[PDB]
């Protein structure tokens, strides 16, 4: 079972936001309550609200007069709006499976909750004015002169965040993806790299791959050795 | 609304006991949630009916109980329910769980120059990469020849990786003249009262 989450990235401030959660290899989804939460940064995880098949929706009492979850069963695919955005709703928002057992007659009450089982990677919100803007992806070529670190260095982009691959997916060993760095300008860059044989460097053609989805944006970046 | 202490620690092998507490736990079975920094919460705690993890419960309190605990154990730990008129659910605060005990660990720095083609932009960045620290604090500074930098430096704060050490990045803006103009610059890291300092320079392959 898998959840995969997708939204704008950004928000404007009053506007509203509208995110979605595609459910796959789920063969009993009409079971289960199908759950949205959040994570303000550093902070704990809240609970926002579900939806059940029936299309029976429970919120977040604090919450409740900004948002409205939906529930496209042909998918399946379920959707969160929350109107009325602030900086205080900037965050990582998550989809879940709060899966459900049955036991006996649901209508006596005869079920219960497993727990919040499938969780997507959650994806990241901010609320801002601010225009959104993709990177600049400079490549950080390999040392010289075993083992040889190489890289990309993506610059200057808002909001968060971008995802680094190598190689379409096929190079995960020795890849390490850092955190962003807040610049003064208000844009984030941060750096991937990869450690990889010395003796390849010549052979194997290392690709970045970084997408920044929130400007429907993503570039692939030869990293070569210096000339 | 649900209360869990805000940190426990303990040492390895030990057991740790985190608790959730709160007015709905009495009718309300608590279920139990693990993240770490920068990944999605794990359920570690369901309800399987009408192997180092187990819950207990008491009145008002359920205790989430992790035997032989290790440093892979470090880890934000949720607690969470349903009102008892059944009309939501909620997660309590969290519990920040340390592992004490761990080795100290000496940073691994990777000094990159700006690229040729950031240069032909017009711009200049160096990208000091710090990881493999523990614990996780480091000051950085930068060097432009043998003098400090005194503008153009971005530092993060650290971040917890996935094998409990830790990871930053600082960056050095400049243009591409003051990248030329200087015989080198280096960027030097200080943890624990050691340092390890890597230097580049403009006319170095």
């Known amino acids: 079972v898998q959840l995969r989450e997708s939204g704008p990235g950004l928000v404007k401030p009053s506007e509203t936001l509208s995110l979605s959660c595609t459910v796959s290899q789920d063969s009993r989804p009409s079971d289960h309550s199908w759950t949205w939460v959040r994570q303000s940064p550093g902070k704990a995880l809240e609970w926002i609200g579900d939806?059940?098949?029936?299309?029976?929706?429970t919120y977040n009492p604090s919450l409740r007069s900004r948002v409205r979850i939906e529930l496209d069963q042909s998918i399946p695919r379920f959707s969160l709006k929350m109107t009325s955005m602030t900086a205080a709703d900037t965050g990582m928002y998550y989809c879940?499976?709060?899966?459900?057992?049955?036991?006996?007659?649901?209508?006596?009450?005869?079920?219960?909750?497993?727990?919040?089982?499938?969780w997507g990677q959650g994806t990241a919100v901010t609320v801002s004015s601010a225009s959104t803007k993709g990177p600049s992806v400079f490549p950080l070529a390999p040392s010289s002169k075993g083992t040889a670190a190489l890289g990309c260095l993506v610059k200057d982009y808002f909001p968060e965040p971008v995802t680094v691959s190598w190689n379409s997916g096929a190079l995960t060993s020795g890849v390490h993806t850092f955190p962003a760095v807040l610049q003064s300008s208000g844009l984030y860059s941060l750096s991937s790299v990869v450690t990889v044989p010395s003796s390849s460097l010549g052979t194997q053609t290392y690709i970045c791959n970084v997408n920044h989805k929130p400007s429907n944006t993503k570039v692939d970046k030869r990293v070569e050795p210096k000339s | 609304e649900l209360t869990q202490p805000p940190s426990v620690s303990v040492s390895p092998g030990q057991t740790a006991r985190i608790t959730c507490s709160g007015a709905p736990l009495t009718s309300r079975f608590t279920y139990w949630y693990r993240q770490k920094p920068g990944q999605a919460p794990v359920l570690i705690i369901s309800?399987?009916?009408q192997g180092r993890f187990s819950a207990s419960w008491s009145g008002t309190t359920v205790t989430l109980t992790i035997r032989g605990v290790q440093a892979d154990d470090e880890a934000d730990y949720y607690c969470?329910?349903?009102?008892?008129?059944?009309?939501?659910?909620?997660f309590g605060g969290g519990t920040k769980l340390t592992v004490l005990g761990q080795p100290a660990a000496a940073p691994s720095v990777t000094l990159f120059p700006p690229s040729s083609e950031e240069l032909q932009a017009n711009k200049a960045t160096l990208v000091c990469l710090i990881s493999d620290f523990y614990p996780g604090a480091v000051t950085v500074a930068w060097k432009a020849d043998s003098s400090p930098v005194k503008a153009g430096v971005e530092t993060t704060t650290p971040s917890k990786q996935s094998n409990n050490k830790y990871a930053a990045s600082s960056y050095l803006s400049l243009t591409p003249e003051q990248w030329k103009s200087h015989k080198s610059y280096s960027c030097q890291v200080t943890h624990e009262g050691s340092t390890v300092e890597k230097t580049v320079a403009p006319t170095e392959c």
């Open positions: 939806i059940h098949y029936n299309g029976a929706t």
């Open positions: 879940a499976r709060n899966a459900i057992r049955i036991y006996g007659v649901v209508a006596l009450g005869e079920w219960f909750h497993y727990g919040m089982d499938v």
């Open positions: 309800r399987s009916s």
């Open positions: 969470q329910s349903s009102d008892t008129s059944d009309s939501y659910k909620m």
